């Protein structure tokens, strides 16, 4: 079957199909994804007034991120269920093209909107020392956009053209390392002038940031992390990828937002 | 028909099918489930300001639990209606695979999110004495996650492999007993220093907790509680399970949340 | 056709079918039903602060009842439109089993949730004199549940077994009369100690309560109220039942809630 | 094809069909309808505290009207798109009975709910002089209900029985003229005692009321306003009717609500 | 086949079809569109109280624009997914007429509602000097309506009749130039008497306004901007148009709204 520039989920769906566990787990984990975002939305709105006026923009940005993210993750979950249909005869779920092909692009577009705001929002809680607010913001916004856009292009080729896949991924990675570099600077400068309690939370924010953000490129590469015809080029790789994306998105948005809010409270007088 | 690692609802649906009463009641009770969660959401938001600032995080946690739970229970209800279709010829509802197989996993994922928050939220109303807040929290969160994850794995095998079903269920039970142990400690320490009215509510919270949480393993086992080819391995067992899950979820979240809110009011200087 | 323990709507749908007027009116009236509930939700939230803090729980309870009532009535409306499909050849709507059979149980489960809260909520506005608060509450909650549960069982048999239908209905009625008895007591005791304006509203609340609550058993019996092969065992009876249920639910929840709120305002100082 | 007591939209759909422009425009205008209602809902909620406490019930009533209006108008829009399907062979949209017949009754039921509230709400902004509040309210509510109910019955016969159509329409019109009479009285009495700025707005409210409310009977009659086999008994008449209903509903609810809010501000210390 | 007066998306869909990238990207970008509107809605509501009472109407107008716009863009995204279905044999998405033809009219009707409010809302933040408030408002509202209505008519003919397409587009352009002229006047008069900070933001508002609003006519013409049988008369032109519309709508509403809110803050005592 000709699928063209399609995600590997479709190729697994079109050949081996998905077992009950593989199909149901992916449906469940993706549903958890958007459910957590809407739960987070309520949390962030309800806790806005827990911090001083000057910190509240960060709480507002956390809630705004939850909107977008809930709608895009909900669309991603519907895309998974509509793309794969039970075959009575073999008792597995196969590609149902009439529901459209499955594409991870809904999730990517959530990143496009939300990355700029997640990077931006910490600048409302911490004070920089050396760096100018507008400079850091502009670096975050440019590199954030380019990281997501180049990755979005790459992932269309993850089966149809491994070279394009890896080149676009590599370019994306460059922008990723730039963001990590700037965010480390922001964390360090944020630490000077604030209580030891505040410094501890910023340490935790950095570890959360580093682990959660590194998951994404892992999920990008997931199908190929065990090489050609590896364990992970399979329904097991599909499950692994969608779990990791869901953990990443929950961690990078909700937990991140909670930690920033807790920092804002400690700095609040 | 090969169904593989599927819930027993599908096997009943695929052989005997469901009577009008069995099918409609399950649809109704599952719908009640998500409707109560959204009603609860409004209640908890609207009553935030009925308690002192320091208690209000518990009300917020109750509302956050209602969100997740409404979406997952709504998805669980849609899964039931889509999976079973009326046959004109025999006048019963049979497995319609085109709607996907029915799986209770939507409900389980609601547990994964919400158990950590339900255990956590009492620590914002009561004061511990001897135990450290961070220690109790960490015990709740680790054991809560492991309980739900191991159960989630088990329930895929509830027909296809009785051994896996019962071993994963047993491991889940171990973590369950750990949580009961810690929650008893938390209740006892919570009772010290507070009015007799407050102590009465905490007693009631503990009974509600113990009964409501014990329903879950009952619902897990439901199809087999009358042995091989028993009364409950049937549409009657399907009805029983989905009723018990719905009662449990309403009790463990909404009533629990209401009792905690009533405790918060008694401990409030406004009262 | 084999329909088993199914509501009489399906039997009419399966034999005579529904005319355009019968089908459209039922769809419209059921839609009005859930629309009024969501309108009520907004009204009750927006008017919370029109009464003293000590009355506001009644306003909150009215809003909570609307949320469950809107969701269940909306589901009941979809059940109607999905269950009956236009036949081009005869120009009438017939049972389409693929949409599931039509059952009034969605409405009944709204009663199960909401009856306990409607009875309870008046105890936050009025003061009892002779009766104990916990006793009245317990009587309301026990009898409310038993009334709706026994009715819910009965209505499955409204065609398949007239005897079961009428026995379960009779048991339901007993619990109904108990509730009427207690509510009369509560109204009377509520009247003592309060302004004549407040007493007048409580008089009106009692008339509304008595008429609105009596409609339900009428709607239960509707198909048979003109005997065997009567005018009402027909699309006209289907229309009559769904109108009466909709009027009852609007009256017993929304108008009831408005009157209680107006009482709360008069008692507000 | 026998359609029975069905709206003329179905007869056009079943014979000539609808062009792309006719079908898409109707879908768009009906969508605009419910979108404006939800936009209005937010406006009215957000502006509640712009007026004195004693005027705020009018703002609340405007918001409550929007909730019913959005749900019913949304249902009316879905009824349109579901009822008419593209035919590849002729490139026109034809009646698809599987989606149900199209009926304007969803809109009518929005009137049933909302007319009583729109008439009522002005009595919270203006003071009567000679007329009794309870008398005006009761006249509005009785005549409002009878106007909508009689029209609702009439419109089922707009093709199948022109006599019934026009008699029910005529009866509806009588109640309409009664409402116009009472509302004129209410406007005049409202003008006494208030600033010239307030009087100007009440003049505008009367013109808006008179034009917007007169559109409805025009839309009722639309298909026949060019006589037998006229220009308007056609997809052009369908477009014209649905445009006029949408303009009327937006004017009579949203603009009306805005003008009343502006009056409330004028009368506010 | 016969598509009649239909958008060029359908003609591409009906002949060449859409590749996975072309179809998925359009679905993603249109989804991003409505997601950003709902994220914006939350931002504007949550920041209302950041400005003086007298500026807050502008913040409220930004939120009201977000409602309409979210619903219309959401409908536009659904229209795209239901209109184009995967063909297993060739592995491309082709016109599925059963989902209705695709039409950009949902977006146009969002313009009809929202243009009048976007133009109006700046008059609540700036003070005019020479020009009269009522005159500017009336010019905006008349020309805004005529611009959108004439464009809406034109776009039906964008394949079926190039002459009608370009004449209606030209008339639309005339009203566009009128609006640009008046808005420049409003910006200039707004700048007189206010802080340098205020003047800077108004300069930025003008550049954003000019670029964002100019994108629309570009998107209108997109399929023909590379002439007969050009690169852009293709799935690439479909992608280009829907990207530009989405960027325009986000820029002209959300960014515009943020800048106006920031202006309101600087002018706030
Ligand atoms: C920041 C802006 C950077 C953009 C610069 C260059 C685009 C690079 C495009 C890379 C696409 C690679 C195509 C490819 O690898 O194709 C080889 C062959 O077709 C496989 O068999
Ligand atoms: C604007 C950026 C759009 C750039 C999209 C073009 C890149 C496509 C690409 O990388 O091509 C892969 C290679 O041709 C194998 O098919
Ligand atoms: C990590 C989750 C991995 C859990 C996998 C355990 C599967 C299992 O229990 O196997 C029994 C089955 O019947 C035969 O494969
Ligand atoms: C638990 C309550 C379940 C009660 C079951 C009701 C059965 C009934 O009343 O009806 C029996 C008869 O067969 C009707 O045709
Ligand atoms: C109140 C219900 C009144 C509804 C009855 C109206 C019937 C009608 O007007 O139709 C008469 C005509 O002779 C037949 O088409
Ligand atoms: C008022 C709106 C009515 C405007 C209708 C204009 C129709 C048009 O422009 O004509 C298309 C051309 O005749 C096709 O060949
Ligand atoms: C809430 C969403 C967030 C924080 C998203 C983060 C996304 C990334 C850090 C993505 C990184 C990627 C690479 C470094 C290479 C491959 C492509 C990406 C976009 C997945
Ligand atoms: C809000 C939902 C709650 C409180 C969920 C509670 C879930 C349990 C206590 C589950 C217990 C289980 C066992 C002890 C064994 C079998 C598997 C489980 C997960 C059902
Ligand atoms: C908002 C919902 C309310 C107040 C529901 C009330 C329901 C009843 C009073 C039902 C009464 C019934 C009987 C007395 C006999 C037949 C069965 C019932 C449940 C319809
Ligand atoms: C918000 C909705 C409003 C204000 C609805 C108004 C409806 C009317 C004034 C209807 C009038 C009619 C007649 C006078 C004759 C024909 C039937 C009606 C109902 C369309
Ligand atoms: C949020 C929506 C906005 C600001 C919409 C703006 C729309 C335009 C400026 C449209 C302009 C057009 C022309 C000048 C010619 C072709 C037709 C139009 C309507 C696209
Ligand atoms: C995975 C759980 C996600 C649930 C939604 C987010 C809820 C936020 C929890 C707040 C915790 C409060 C800690 C403050 C000390
Ligand atoms: C079916 C709809 C699902 C509900 C989604 C819930 C999240 C929406 C966020 C709105 C919550 C508003 C809370 C504001 C309360 C302010 C303080 C308490 C008084
Ligand atoms: C003592 C005051 C407690 C009031 C109880 C109100 C309960 C509201 C919960 C709403 C959830 C739906 C009902 C099951
Ligand atoms: C003035 C008192 C405080 C305002 C409370 C805000 C209420 C937020 C409600 C959240 C959602 C509840 C259910 C939504 C109805 C479903 C809509 C479809
Ligand atoms: C054939 C039965 C074997 C299945 C047993 C699975 C138990 C897994 C438990 C892991 C700990
Ligand atoms: C003081 C009296 C105020 C009465 C307000 C009535 C509003 C009721 C709204 C319920 C929704 C519509 C019901 C038809
Ligand atoms: C200033 C007072 C604030 C009042 C809070 C508003 C309460 C909103 C509750 C939700 C009402 C339902 C609205 C329907 C939304 C439909 C979405 C599609
Ligand atoms: C074939 C006819 C049989 C119909 C008789 C069914 C009647 C059942 C009534 C059961 C009563 C239960 C009492 C419960 C009280 C609480
Ligand atoms: C004080 C001046 C009046 C402000 C007018 C605000 C306009 C309200 C808009 C609400 C509904 C939006 C859709 C209407 C467009 C037709
Ligand atoms: C700062 C003042 C707070 C006032 C609260 C107003 C919020 C009301 C929002 C409810 C209206 C819903 C309209 C959009 C819903 C989107 C659909 C999902
Ligand atoms: C009450 C008025 C009903 C009028 C019906 C007229 C029917 C005419 C039949 C040809
Ligand atoms: C001065 C404060 C600036 C913060 C504004 C950010 C709010 C924007 C919310 C809408 C979603 C953003 C998507 C952009 C791409
Ligand atoms: C400081 C408290 C302010 C309370 C106002 C917050 C209410 C905003 C709700 C508006 C709706 C935004 C989008 C909701 C998404 C839900 C979709 C389901
Ligand atoms: C406003 C005027 C619209 C211009 C319409 C031009 C029609 C051109 C006719 C060409 C032959 C089909
Ligand atoms: C950084 C990780 C780089 C991964 C190296 C690319 C491995 C390419 O392996 C690919 O695996 C597929 C499934 O097994 C095969 O179908 C492809 O033919 C093969 O190219
Ligand atoms: C601790 C709970 C008791 C578990 C007892 C497991 C014995 C169940 O036995 C099972 O019953 C099913 C239904 O009748 C049959 O289909 C299976 O063949 C049979 O293995
Ligand atoms: C208190 C009201 C109870 C009245 C019971 C009357 C018995 C109804 O009689 C039933 O009517 C049906 C249709 O008319 C028939 O099909 C049934 O054969 C018949 O049992
Ligand atoms: C405003 C009152 C106008 C009533 C005039 C009714 C005359 C219309 O007459 C009707 O027109 C239909 C379509 O043209 C025909 O199909 C019908 O046969 C005809 O009865
Ligand atoms: C601003 C641009 C003005 C419009 C340019 C006129 C070009 C019209 O060219 C058109 O291009 C289509 C696709 O190539 C062809 O299918 C049409 O038949 C042709 O009329
Ligand atoms: Na599926
Ligand atoms: Na079903
Ligand atoms: Na139907
Ligand atoms: Na259609
Ligand atoms: Na599609």
Author numbering:
A (entry chain C), C (entry chain E), D (entry chain A), E (entry chain B): 3 to 271
B (entry chain D): 3 to 273
What does the paper behind this entry write?
Microbial rhodopsins (MRs) are transmembrane light-sensitive proteins, found in Archaea, Bacteria, Eukaryota, and also viruses. MRs are composed of seven transmembrane α-helices (A–G) with the cofactor retinal covalently bound to the lysine residue of helix G via the Schiff base (RSB). Despite this paradigm, the first light-driven Na+ pump KR2 was identified in Krokinobacter eikastus in 20132. KR2 contains a characteristic for all known Na+-pumping rhodopsins (NaRs) set of N112, D116, Q123 residues in the helix C (NDQ motif).
To understand better the nature of conformational switches in KR2 and the influence of D116 protonation on the protein conformation, we produced and crystallized KR2-D116N at pH 8.0, which mimics the WT protein with fully protonated D116 and solved its structure in the pentameric form at 2.35 Å. Confirming our hypothesis, the structure shows that introduction of asparagine at the position of D116 led to the flip of the side chains of N112 and L74 in comparison to the ground state of the wild type (WT) protein and disappearance of the SBC1, characteristic for the ‘expanded’ conformation. Overall, the structure of D116N is very similar to that of the O-state (RMSD 0.2 Å) and also to the ‘compact’ conformation (RMSD 0.3 Å) of the KR2-WT. However, Na+ is absent inside the protomers and the relative orientation of the RSBH+ and N116 is altered. Particularly, the RSBH+ forms two alternative conformations, and hydrogen bond between the RSBH+ and N116 is absent.We also observed that D116 protonation destabilizes the pentameric assembly of KR2. Thus, we suggest that neutralization of D116 is the key determinant of the formation of the ‘compact’ conformation, which explains their structural similarity. Importantly, the organization of the pIRC2 region is identical in the O-state and KR2-D116N. It means that the rearrangements on the surface of the KR2 occur not directly in response to the retinal isomerization upon photon absorption, but rather due to the redistribution of charges in the central inner part of the protein protomer.
